[PDB]
Every structure is written in structure tokens, then in C-alpha cells.
Amino acid sequence: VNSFSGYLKLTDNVYIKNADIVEEAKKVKPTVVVNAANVYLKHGGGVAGALNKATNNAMQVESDDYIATNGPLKVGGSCVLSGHNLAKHCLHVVGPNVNKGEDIQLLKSAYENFNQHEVLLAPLLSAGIFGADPIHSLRVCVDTVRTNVYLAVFDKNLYDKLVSSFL
Ligand SMILES: OCC[C@H](CO)Nc1ncnc2[nH]ccc12
Ligand SMILES: [Cl-]
């Protein structure tokens, strides 16, 4: 039993809800919140910009030190950093950004990072400003993640389409 509330069960382990991931994280304080990161951990907009703003820019400061030490992530890769005031940990995961010409096949590799954590709050990878089809991202999530994932979808119209079209 966990404290996630109001989710629709899609499979044994994947759940979905219309919600602002920032407001969800603040309420639940999950062990892990997933950020929709880029390789430079520059959290300027989308999920990343919103999560960082909610930390009063502490996420960005921590991320800049991470990059200075380790260099950029790989597309499809991840790193674990602090969750600040939102969660215990933040798993920064880089899905492919179609608007940069990045290979969508790397979306499965990105979701594989979730399997290293027993329970996660997350957005759909490569959706939004990363330009991929959110229906496809949900399919890859369901077919790749085996741990318990609670997906927050910000747009109510998109949420209803993902549910009504889900196979
Ligand atoms: O699930 C990823 C794609 C959705 C499309 O609505 N974007 C978001 N979902 C949840 N929380 C969010 N906060 C800021 C953006 C955002
Ligand atoms: Cl977005």
C-alpha cells in the first residue's frame, strides 16, 4: 500500500492520472520523482522547468555541479540527484527529443532506468516539448517498466485520450 490517490490502473504496475507533477510530488513526497531532463540538466521549461522552479532553483544549482564533475548524460540515460522539497530523490531521465532529431528508439532505453526503483512518480517520457507522441510513450512505458509507476499527465484533454485509446 502507498499514498498515491486518484489514479486509474492501466496494468498490474502502471497507473495514470490527470495532475500537475509538481503538485503531486509536494503532496505525496515520493521516494522518487522522475524529471524529463536533457543531457545538460538545463531545466528551462516543460516538466523540468516546473520541477526546478518549485525547488527555488536548488535543483539547477545541484545539477550544474553534477555536470561540472561528470559531464553530460547520454540520451536514454539517467542520474539520481536530490529531490529537494519535492521527493527524497529525483531520477533525471533523458528521453529522445524529436525536435532535436534524436532517435525515438532510445525511448525504451530511457524507460529502462525506471526499473532500478521500486516505486516512482513520473511524467510521460519525450512527451510535451520533447515532441514525441504521448500515446506511443505510454505504450513503451507499459511494455518496458516492471516496477510501480504513477504517471502524472498535466493536460486534461491529453489524459482522456490516453485512457480512451489505451489497449
Ligand atoms: O507527462 C509528460 C507530458 C505532459 C503533457 O501534459 N506534461 C506534464 N505532465 C505532468 N506534469 C507536468 N508539469 C509540467 C509539464 C507537465
Ligand atoms: Cl511538457
Side-chain angles (χ1 to χ4, degrees), residues 19-22 36 46-48 50-51 122-125 127-128 134 152-156 158:
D20 187 339
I21 192 173
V22 168
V47 168
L51 288 173
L124 282 171
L125 297 182
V153 179
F154 179 57
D155 192 84
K156 168 60 175 171
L158 172 60

mmCIF file of all heavy atoms in Angstrom, residues 19-22 36 46-48 50-51 122-125 127-128 134 152-156 158, ligand 1:
data_model
loop_
_atom_site.group_PDB
_atom_site.id
_atom_site.type_symbol
_atom_site.label_atom_id
_atom_site.label_comp_id
_atom_site.label_asym_id
_atom_site.label_seq_id
_atom_site.Cartn_x
_atom_site.Cartn_y
_atom_site.Cartn_z
ATOM 1 N N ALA A 19 -2.852 15.295 -13.560
ATOM 2 C CA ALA A 19 -2.353 16.040 -12.417
ATOM 3 C C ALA A 19 -1.081 16.765 -12.806
ATOM 4 O O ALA A 19 -0.367 16.346 -13.723
ATOM 5 C CB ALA A 19 -2.087 15.113 -11.226
ATOM 6 N N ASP A 20 -0.821 17.861 -12.098
ATOM 7 C CA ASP A 20 0.442 18.579 -12.179
ATOM 8 C C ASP A 20 1.478 17.827 -11.353
ATOM 9 O O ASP A 20 1.316 17.690 -10.136
ATOM 10 C CB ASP A 20 0.242 19.981 -11.604
ATOM 11 C CG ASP A 20 1.458 20.869 -11.790
ATOM 12 O OD1 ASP A 20 2.568 20.336 -11.981
ATOM 13 O OD2 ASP A 20 1.301 22.111 -11.747
ATOM 14 N N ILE A 21 2.542 17.347 -12.006
ATOM 15 C CA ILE A 21 3.540 16.539 -11.304
ATOM 16 C C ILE A 21 4.163 17.309 -10.146
ATOM 17 O O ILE A 21 4.531 16.717 -9.124
ATOM 18 C CB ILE A 21 4.599 15.986 -12.286
ATOM 19 C CG1 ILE A 21 5.460 14.921 -11.596
ATOM 20 C CG2 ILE A 21 5.458 17.114 -12.858
ATOM 21 C CD1 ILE A 21 6.415 14.201 -12.528
ATOM 22 N N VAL A 22 4.285 18.632 -10.274
ATOM 23 C CA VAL A 22 4.807 19.444 -9.176
ATOM 24 C C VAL A 22 3.887 19.363 -7.965
ATOM 25 O O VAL A 22 4.337 19.170 -6.828
ATOM 26 C CB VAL A 22 4.999 20.900 -9.631
ATOM 27 C CG1 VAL A 22 5.247 21.801 -8.425
ATOM 28 C CG2 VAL A 22 6.140 20.991 -10.630
ATOM 29 N N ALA A 36 11.899 14.936 -16.560
ATOM 30 C CA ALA A 36 12.103 14.867 -18.004
ATOM 31 C C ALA A 36 13.274 15.780 -18.360
ATOM 32 O O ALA A 36 13.107 16.929 -18.777
ATOM 33 C CB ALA A 36 10.824 15.258 -18.742
ATOM 34 N N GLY A 46 9.031 23.029 -19.655
ATOM 35 C CA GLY A 46 8.366 21.745 -19.532
ATOM 36 C C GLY A 46 8.381 21.254 -18.097
ATOM 37 O O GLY A 46 8.482 22.033 -17.144
ATOM 38 N N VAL A 47 8.293 19.929 -17.939
ATOM 39 C CA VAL A 47 8.348 19.322 -16.609
ATOM 40 C C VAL A 47 9.588 19.790 -15.850
ATOM 41 O O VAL A 47 9.524 20.113 -14.660
ATOM 42 C CB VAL A 47 8.303 17.787 -16.722
ATOM 43 C CG1 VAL A 47 8.658 17.128 -15.390
ATOM 44 C CG2 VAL A 47 6.929 17.327 -17.200
ATOM 45 N N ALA A 48 10.739 19.795 -16.520
ATOM 46 C CA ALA A 48 11.993 20.137 -15.849
ATOM 47 C C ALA A 48 11.976 21.571 -15.330
ATOM 48 O O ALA A 48 12.351 21.834 -14.183
ATOM 49 C CB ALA A 48 13.154 19.934 -16.817
ATOM 50 N N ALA A 50 9.385 23.339 -14.562
ATOM 51 C CA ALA A 50 8.415 23.434 -13.477
ATOM 52 C C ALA A 50 8.942 22.802 -12.190
ATOM 53 O O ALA A 50 8.809 23.385 -11.108
ATOM 54 C CB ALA A 50 7.093 22.797 -13.913
ATOM 55 N N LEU A 51 9.551 21.616 -12.278
ATOM 56 C CA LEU A 51 10.108 20.995 -11.078
ATOM 57 C C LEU A 51 11.202 21.864 -10.476
ATOM 58 O O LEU A 51 11.302 22.000 -9.251
ATOM 59 C CB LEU A 51 10.664 19.606 -11.405
ATOM 60 C CG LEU A 51 9.647 18.499 -11.696
ATOM 61 C CD1 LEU A 51 10.338 17.226 -12.168
ATOM 62 C CD2 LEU A 51 8.790 18.209 -10.472
ATOM 63 N N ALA A 122 6.089 9.970 -12.087
ATOM 64 C CA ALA A 122 6.786 10.273 -13.330
ATOM 65 C C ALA A 122 5.838 10.953 -14.312
ATOM 66 O O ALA A 122 4.612 10.782 -14.232
ATOM 67 C CB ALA A 122 7.374 9.004 -13.959
ATOM 68 N N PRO A 123 6.384 11.707 -15.260
ATOM 69 C CA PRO A 123 5.646 12.121 -16.452
ATOM 70 C C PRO A 123 5.893 11.102 -17.561
ATOM 71 O O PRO A 123 6.706 10.185 -17.426
ATOM 72 C CB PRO A 123 6.335 13.449 -16.799
ATOM 73 C CG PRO A 123 7.778 13.159 -16.480
ATOM 74 C CD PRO A 123 7.738 12.294 -15.231
ATOM 75 N N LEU A 124 5.194 11.293 -18.680
ATOM 76 C CA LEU A 124 5.464 10.504 -19.875
ATOM 77 C C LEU A 124 6.731 11.014 -20.554
ATOM 78 O O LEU A 124 6.859 12.208 -20.840
ATOM 79 C CB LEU A 124 4.279 10.559 -20.840
ATOM 80 C CG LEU A 124 3.093 9.659 -20.483
ATOM 81 C CD1 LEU A 124 1.917 9.967 -21.393
ATOM 82 C CD2 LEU A 124 3.466 8.183 -20.579
ATOM 83 N N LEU A 125 7.672 10.106 -20.801
ATOM 84 C CA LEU A 125 8.958 10.488 -21.364
ATOM 85 C C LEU A 125 8.819 10.887 -22.828
ATOM 86 O O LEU A 125 8.116 10.238 -23.611
ATOM 87 C CB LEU A 125 9.953 9.331 -21.245
ATOM 88 C CG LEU A 125 10.314 8.878 -19.831
ATOM 89 C CD1 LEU A 125 11.334 7.760 -19.897
ATOM 90 C CD2 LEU A 125 10.847 10.035 -19.014
ATOM 91 N N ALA A 127 7.298 13.263 -24.117
ATOM 92 C CA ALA A 127 6.071 13.974 -24.435
ATOM 93 C C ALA A 127 6.296 15.481 -24.298
ATOM 94 O O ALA A 127 7.404 15.957 -24.033
ATOM 95 C CB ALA A 127 4.923 13.475 -23.554
ATOM 96 N N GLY A 128 5.231 16.247 -24.499
ATOM 97 C CA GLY A 128 5.349 17.687 -24.373
ATOM 98 C C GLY A 128 6.374 18.250 -25.336
ATOM 99 O O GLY A 128 6.429 17.875 -26.515
ATOM 100 N N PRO A 134 2.527 11.204 -27.237
ATOM 101 C CA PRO A 134 2.308 10.676 -25.878
ATOM 102 C C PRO A 134 1.637 9.312 -25.834
ATOM 103 O O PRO A 134 1.874 8.562 -24.881
ATOM 104 C CB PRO A 134 1.457 11.765 -25.205
ATOM 105 C CG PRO A 134 0.846 12.535 -26.336
ATOM 106 C CD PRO A 134 1.857 12.499 -27.439
ATOM 107 N N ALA A 152 1.764 11.114 -14.048
ATOM 108 C CA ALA A 152 1.021 12.363 -13.966
ATOM 109 C C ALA A 152 1.032 13.019 -15.340
ATOM 110 O O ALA A 152 2.103 13.277 -15.897
ATOM 111 C CB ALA A 152 1.641 13.293 -12.927
ATOM 112 N N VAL A 153 -0.164 13.285 -15.857
ATOM 113 C CA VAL A 153 -0.377 13.921 -17.149
ATOM 114 C C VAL A 153 -1.000 15.282 -16.880
ATOM 115 O O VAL A 153 -2.104 15.368 -16.329
ATOM 116 C CB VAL A 153 -1.286 13.063 -18.040
ATOM 117 C CG1 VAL A 153 -1.536 13.741 -19.378
ATOM 118 C CG2 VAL A 153 -0.659 11.689 -18.238
ATOM 119 N N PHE A 154 -0.293 16.349 -17.267
ATOM 120 C CA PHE A 154 -0.728 17.703 -16.920
ATOM 121 C C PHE A 154 -2.000 18.104 -17.660
ATOM 122 O O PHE A 154 -2.901 18.709 -17.069
ATOM 123 C CB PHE A 154 0.396 18.701 -17.204
ATOM 124 C CG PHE A 154 0.030 20.130 -16.895
ATOM 125 C CD1 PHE A 154 -0.403 20.483 -15.627
ATOM 126 C CD2 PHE A 154 0.119 21.115 -17.867
ATOM 127 C CE1 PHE A 154 -0.744 21.790 -15.332
ATOM 128 C CE2 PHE A 154 -0.218 22.429 -17.577
ATOM 129 C CZ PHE A 154 -0.645 22.766 -16.305
ATOM 130 N N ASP A 155 -2.092 17.781 -18.946
ATOM 131 C CA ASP A 155 -3.183 18.238 -19.799
ATOM 132 C C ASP A 155 -4.382 17.300 -19.671
ATOM 133 O O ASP A 155 -4.268 16.102 -19.953
ATOM 134 C CB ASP A 155 -2.693 18.273 -21.243
ATOM 135 C CG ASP A 155 -3.656 18.995 -22.162
ATOM 136 O OD1 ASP A 155 -3.594 20.240 -22.241
ATOM 137 O OD2 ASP A 155 -4.498 18.317 -22.785
ATOM 138 N N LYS A 156 -5.537 17.847 -19.270
ATOM 139 C CA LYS A 156 -6.721 17.012 -19.066
ATOM 140 C C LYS A 156 -7.216 16.419 -20.379
ATOM 141 O O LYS A 156 -7.630 15.255 -20.423
ATOM 142 C CB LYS A 156 -7.829 17.818 -18.379
ATOM 143 C CG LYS A 156 -9.215 17.156 -18.376
ATOM 144 C CD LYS A 156 -9.241 15.802 -17.653
ATOM 145 C CE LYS A 156 -10.668 15.249 -17.588
ATOM 146 N NZ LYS A 156 -10.737 13.843 -17.081
ATOM 147 N N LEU A 158 -5.389 15.639 -22.993
ATOM 148 C CA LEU A 158 -4.489 14.544 -23.336
ATOM 149 C C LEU A 158 -4.740 13.333 -22.448
ATOM 150 O O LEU A 158 -4.715 12.190 -22.922
ATOM 151 C CB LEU A 158 -3.035 14.997 -23.226
ATOM 152 C CG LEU A 158 -2.020 13.860 -23.368
ATOM 153 C CD1 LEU A 158 -2.159 13.188 -24.722
ATOM 154 C CD2 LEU A 158 -0.606 14.365 -23.164
HETATM 155 O O1 LIG B 1 3.685 13.718 -18.707
HETATM 156 C C1 LIG B 1 4.605 14.445 -19.587
HETATM 157 C C2 LIG B 1 3.816 15.239 -20.728
HETATM 158 C C3 LIG B 1 2.712 16.161 -20.052
HETATM 159 C C4 LIG B 1 1.647 16.662 -21.107
HETATM 160 O O2 LIG B 1 0.651 17.387 -20.380
HETATM 161 N N1 LIG B 1 3.348 17.283 -19.356
HETATM 162 C C5 LIG B 1 3.347 17.401 -17.934
HETATM 163 N N2 LIG B 1 2.829 16.351 -17.229
HETATM 164 C C6 LIG B 1 2.813 16.428 -15.886
HETATM 165 N N3 LIG B 1 3.251 17.458 -15.139
HETATM 166 C C7 LIG B 1 3.774 18.463 -15.881
HETATM 167 N N4 LIG B 1 4.287 19.643 -15.339
HETATM 168 C C8 LIG B 1 4.746 20.443 -16.361
HETATM 169 C C9 LIG B 1 4.510 19.808 -17.580
HETATM 170 C C10 LIG B 1 3.883 18.533 -17.292
#
